[PDB]
Design an enzyme around this catalytic site. Structure first.
Site, PDB file in Angstrom:
ATOM      1  N   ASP A 106       0.817  -1.298   0.079  1.00  0.00           N
ATOM      2  CA  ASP A 106       0.035  -0.047   0.122  1.00  0.00           C
ATOM      3  C   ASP A 106       0.897   1.368  -0.023  1.00  0.00           C
ATOM      4  OD1 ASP A 106      -2.753  -0.441  -0.282  1.00  0.00           O
ATOM      5  OD2 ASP A 106      -3.194   0.998   1.298  1.00  0.00           O
TER       6      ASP A 106
ATOM      7  N   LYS B 277       3.291   1.608  -4.890  1.00  0.00           N
ATOM      8  CA  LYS B 277       4.141   1.222  -6.066  1.00  0.00           C
ATOM      9  C   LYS B 277       3.455   1.212  -7.379  1.00  0.00           C
ATOM     10  CE  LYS B 277       4.499  -2.731  -3.713  1.00  0.00           C
ATOM     11  NZ  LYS B 277       3.831  -2.289  -2.594  1.00  0.00           N
TER      12      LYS B 277
END
Ligand SMILES: Nc1nc2c(ncn2[C@@H]2O[C@H](COP(=O)(O)OP(=O)(O)NP(=O)(O)O)[C@@H](O)[C@H]2O)c(=O)[nH]1
Ligand SMILES: [Mg+2]
Ligand SMILES: [N+]
Length: 403
Positions: free
Chosen positions: A19, A22
């Site tokens: 989270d 990316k």
């Protein structure tokens, strides 16, 4: 169409804790690059987290490959999952990177998979890391930013990266991506958040060198995934480690099966564009004749026929992680039976300790013998990771091939 080589090619990608951003960054990179180079096809968030199971669980599961380019270079970019239950997928992704972008949330700082991803990237040979400190839009306090940068730099040093040297770019993947949606033609210098992405691209351009690659040695491509293309056949994807492959070449599928089998390459593609010839460094899809997707699998390697012999038994020098590094709390004995990860290969192996060595403890540097339950492409000096019960327990290097 066809793939025209205009500039050098480098493989990069995104790693970091669940989270931290990316996939949003990956999308943002495609949009920002596309405004300068019209050869870049933009990839929205949902184009990357595309699988029904990704939509279901709300996380990246599969590694996605996207393409972008700068004035300097051509990039294949592998976006990896951060979720702790999908580390095997991340390892297979990292195994393709000539350099990694480590995404760290400015709001959370480094987290358990920040550490685990750095560790594992090393064990599959990622030579360089650039840091993108994400979600600064959420952090007002400049002190916490400096703190997070500091912690990340120190953590890199712990796994033998030049932590005090790596570029740390601060920005907002989301706010850049939003700007590009509002204005897809947004150029450099026009928007604060988009320029931070350019800062990242510059650092990638200049800090991650183009690797030295041998195109003269025998063809070797570790398989990262396999799928069936309707109408065409079975495609094995991966980064060509060395040598070259042309349509019409017979290749050998090596590893994970009792015996090796031969097939003819009938297509080579890089990002859905047909290659004359695939060469070392290229991230390609290789169309294989006469094999189904049940006869080729991730972790096998495609090789020049007869150039590789798969192995089962080897000596290794191994570091066993302390629990503070997220490893085991207790030691193990001979007969310990974890998973071993070499490049894109994952396979169960048996630890066989020297006569006199009864028990190995967390924090020990040690040598022992490993016997894999399937033959695998191996080389002396090949680094590997050890994992068991859903956590990384060790890092090793092959020191001697026994069988
Ligand atoms: N405020 C803010 N939120 C962001 C930013 N970048 C991403 N996010 C939010 O962070 C969440 C996670 O984004 P995502 O890109 O999926 O992260 P991830 O690291 O790819 N996750 P995973 O490990 O599952 O692959 C989303 O809700 C996204 O909108 C940013 O720069 N600022
Ligand atoms: Mg993701
Ligand atoms: N994905």
């Amino acid at each position: 169409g066809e793939f025209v080589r205009t500039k050098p090619h480098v493989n990069v990608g995104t790693i970091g804790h669940v989270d931290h951003g990316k996939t949003t960054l990956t999308a943002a990179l495609t949009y920002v690059a596309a405004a300068e180079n019209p050869n870049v096809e933009v990839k929205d968030y949902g184009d990357i987290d595309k699988a029904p199971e990704e939509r279901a669980r709300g996380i990246t599961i599969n590694t996605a490959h996207v393409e972008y380019e700068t004035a300097k270079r051509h990039y294949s970019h592998v976006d990896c999952p951060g979720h702790a239950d999908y580390i095997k997928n991340m390892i297979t992704g990292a195994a393709q990177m000539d350099g990694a972008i480590l995404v760290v949330s400015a709001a959370d700082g480094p987290m358990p998979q920040t550490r685990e991803h750095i560790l594992l990237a090393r064990q599959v040979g990622v030579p360089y890391i650039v840091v993108f400190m994400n979600k600064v839009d959420m952090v007002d306090d400049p002190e916490l930013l400096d703190l997070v940068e500091m912690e990340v730099r120190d953590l890199l040093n712990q796994y033998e990266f030049p932590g005090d040297e790596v570029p740390v770019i601060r920005g907002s993947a989301l706010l850049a991506l939003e700007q590009m949606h509002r204005n897809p033609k947004t150029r450099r210098g026009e928007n604060e958040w988009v320029d931070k992405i350019w800062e990242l691209l510059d650092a990638i351009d200049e800090y991650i060198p183009t690797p030295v690659r041998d195109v003269d040695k025998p063809f070797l491509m570790p398989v990262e995934d396999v799928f069936t293309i309707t109408g065409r056949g079975t495609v094995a994807t991966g980064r060509i480690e060395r040598g070259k492959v042309k349509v019409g070449d017979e290749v050998e599928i090596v590893g994970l099966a009792p015996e090796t089998r031969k097939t003819v390459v009938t297509g080579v593609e890089m990002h859905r564009k047909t290659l004359q010839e695939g060469i070392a460094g290229d991230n390609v899809g290789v169309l294989l004749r006469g094999v189904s997707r049940e006869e080729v699998e991730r972790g096998q390697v495609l090789a020049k026929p007869g150039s590789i012999t798969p192995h089962t038994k080897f000596e290794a020098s191994v570091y066993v992680l302390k629990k503070e590094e997220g490893g085991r709390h207790t030691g193990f004995f001979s007969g310990y039976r974890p998973q071993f990860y070499f490049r894109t290969t994952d396979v169960t192996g048996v630890v066989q300790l020297p006569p006199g060595v009864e028990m190995v403890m967390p924090g020990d540097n040690v040598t022992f013998t490993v016997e894999l339950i399937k033959p695998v492409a191996l080389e002396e000096g090949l680094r590997f990771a050890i994992r068991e019960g859903g956590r990384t327990v060790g890092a090793g290097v092959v020191t001697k091939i026994l069988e």
